[PDB]
């Protein structure tokens, strides 16, 4: 308990103040948040993992090429850092947590990362590796939030697979082999081929019960949006942010959600 006052107290106070102050306009807000995060530079590993979260997607996008030069336009330092096509993939395998594992898991390069569906599969595998790495750094209450996020991503991928991607070889086995209680009981979603079946599978977790509801919204989207939208709706739990705990990831997630809401506002 005394370690917080021993070190990291000032950074924690600054992060708490910045989060409390938070609430091309979307691009400007994202740039301001990224600058605030960068200026803040134990917690170093947490910041590295938080950045690597979006850096996995940034590297996946940069893996194209095929109009690859356009990736510089979205070079947001929050996720699109320069430090984080097999020949170039081997070079990019450094300075990232999920990259060494993806080097072997996605050794087929574009063959296993086709832009239609297999690129999404490689992105999901990288996200699973990053989630495993983040969960490895256990010791705080953020483990529950990380597990919830990974479960939401896995369940959304499984729902998308059962909806229409089953014809894209995303079968029941692929619901966990390629599509990133879920780390132990994800087998219940392998047969949830229907919206009613999805609700029944969600009934296995009473907290996840009634989250799907009519499933008209949230679950209607493919990729990782089905159960991820449930996490977005329940993010009010993340809004608690009890003191003397790692809240940098929570602040980053809140800033990202605010940026997304501002983008969704657009022209009213």
């Amino acid at each position: 308990a005394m370690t917080f006052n021993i070190h990291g107290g000032y950074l924690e106070a600054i992060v708490r103040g910045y989060r409390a102050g938070l609430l091309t306009i979307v691009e400007k807000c994202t740039l301001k948040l990224v600058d605030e995060y960068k200026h803040m530079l134990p917690l170093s590993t947490f910041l590295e993992y938080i950045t690597y979260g979006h850096m996995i997607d940034n590297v996946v996008l940069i893996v194209t090429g095929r109009d690859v030069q356009e990736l510089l336009e979205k070079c947001h330092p929050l996720g699109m850092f320069d430090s984080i096509m097999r020949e170039l993939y081997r070079l990019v395998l450094v300075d990232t947590p999920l990259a060494p594992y993806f080097s072997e898991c996605i050794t087929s390069e574009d063959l296993d990362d086709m832009n239609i569906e297999i690129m999404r599969n490689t992105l999901y595998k990288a996200y699973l590796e990053d989630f495993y790495k983040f969960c490895q750094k256990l010791g705080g209450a953020t483990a529950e939030i990380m597990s919830d996020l990974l479960a939401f991503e896995a369940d959304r991928r499984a729902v998308n697979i059962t909806i229409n991607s089953i014809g894209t070889e995303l079968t029941r086995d692929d619901r966990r082999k390629l599509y990133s209680l879920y780390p132990y009981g994800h087998e219940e979603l392998a047969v949830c081929e229907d919206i009613d079946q999805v609700r029944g599978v969600m009934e296995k977790y009473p907290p996840y019960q009634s989250i799907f509801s009519k499933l008209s919204y949230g679950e209607s989207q493919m990729l990782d949006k089905a159960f991820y939208e449930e996490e977005v709706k329940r993010l009010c739990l993340a809004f608690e942010q009890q003191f003397h705990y790692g809240v940098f990831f929570a602040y980053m997630r809140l800033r990202e959600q605010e940026i997304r809401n501002l983008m969704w506002i657009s022209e009213c």
Binding site: L61, T64, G65, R66, D67, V68, E70, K74, N115, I116, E117, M119, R120, N160, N164, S165, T168, S220, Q221, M222, L223, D224, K225, E229, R260, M263, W264, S266
Partner: protein, 104 residues
């Protein structure tokens, strides 16, 4: 009459695009161009005859034959239901324009 379809379906496609952007941020674009699940665009032509004029008939992907789909984006279902749904209206408008030009 069908000119208003080019506004209605365009508005629906714009709404679907905004929803997809709110869902997954920036689309993949580039290699696959993202933004859709349907519309493997390939056009087939036919020749009808009205009053001795060889009025052409047009069919294409998502508006006839030669259509294919694979996976899609997060809102790819919504994108197909709005952005790729404008394909039928566009094909009808093109057929009407060609018929009008030939008749003129």
């Amino acid at each position: 009459t069908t000119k208003e379809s080019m506004g209605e379906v365009m508005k629906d496609s714009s709404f679907a695009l905004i929803e997809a952007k709110y869902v997954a941020g920036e689309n993949i674009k580039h290699i696959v161009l993202e933004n859709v699940q349907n519309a493997s665009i390939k056009v087939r032509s036919r020749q009808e005859n009205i009053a001795g004029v060889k009025i052409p008939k047009f069919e294409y992907f998502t508006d006839g034959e030669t259509k294919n789909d694979l996976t899609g984006l997060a809102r790819g279902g919504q994108q197909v239901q709005q952005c790729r749904a404008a394909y039928v209206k566009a094909i009808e408008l093109l057929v009407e324009l060609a018929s009008l030009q030939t008749s003129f």
